[PDB]
Structure 1
Amino acid sequence: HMLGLGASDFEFGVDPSADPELALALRVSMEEQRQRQEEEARRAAAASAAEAGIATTGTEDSDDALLKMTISQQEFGRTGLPDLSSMTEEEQIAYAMQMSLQGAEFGQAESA
């Protein structure tokens, strides 16, 4: 309609060197968006990595079986007494390793 063409006159006819009030106002607004784009960019990095990352299966064919079979031979072995005459080197190892893996604080601390 007219011959003024007001399009690239504000981002070139004056530039930030024409007024620091326009260069500073756009530098404060752009910075606020970057701090939000990152805080928001990583915010999704944890929302997607926790839902589509740790929230997945793997290879647990006999998970409870290892819990039952292992406690089945160890529980039936010990009942009203620490029957060791029937526990072999591995059966006794399960009993000796069961009380030793409960919390190895130190093992060497009596005099000093």
Structure 2
Amino acid sequence: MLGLGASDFEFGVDPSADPELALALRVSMEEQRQRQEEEARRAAAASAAEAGIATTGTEDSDDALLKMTISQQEFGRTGLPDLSSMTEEEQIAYAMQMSLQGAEFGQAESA
């Protein structure tokens, strides 16, 4: 035939054409990292007890201020459509929800 070009492969070759397939392969790689980190960190903790966490006292307050301050700030007040709490994907989750699930206008201009 006289084909062979940018037609036989337009979905299973370039992820830029479909972010659903590009995100699917990104979710699989992230899973392998969870098992490689949860297991890599478990071995780092058992070894830290020998020559890593050798301290007789208490010094776990610096992160408590980072977690306690962000735990109530990141998830505390929600009685308003705040934007600082929504990241670039969280804000996108709201902006994209209106683009597909927010066409409540009538019959003048809608996509």
Q: TM-score, normalised by structure 1?
A: 0.30
**Higher RCO, 1 or 2 (CA under 8 Å, sep at least 6)?**
1
How many residues matched? Answer: 111
- Are the aligned partners of 1:77 and 1:87 in contact in 2 as well (CA < 8 Å)? no
- Are the aligned partners of 2:15 and 2:21 in contact in 1 as well (CA < 8 Å)? yes
CA 1:97–1:62 in structure 2 vs 1: closer, same or farther (change >3 Å)?
farther
In structure 1, runs of 5+ residues without a counterpart are: none
- Are the aligned partners of 2:11 and 2:18 in contact in 1 as well (CA < 8 Å)? no
Question: Which residue in 2 is equivalent to 1:46?
Answer: 45
Larger radius of gyration: 1
SS at match of 2:24: helix
The worse-fitting range, judged by mean Cα deviation, of 17-26 and 36-45 is: 17-26
Q: TM-score, normalised by structure 2?
A: 0.30
Q: CA deviation at 1:46?
A: 1.7
CA 1:59–1:80 in structure 2 vs 1: closer, same or farther (change >3 Å)?
same
User: Identity over aligned residues, as a percent?
Assistant: 100
Question: Which residue in 2 is equivalent to 1:106?
Answer: 105
Q: CA deviation at 1:26?
A: 0.5
Q: 2:67 and 2:6 mapped to 1: Cα distance?
A: 76
Q: CA deviation at 1:42?
A: 0.8
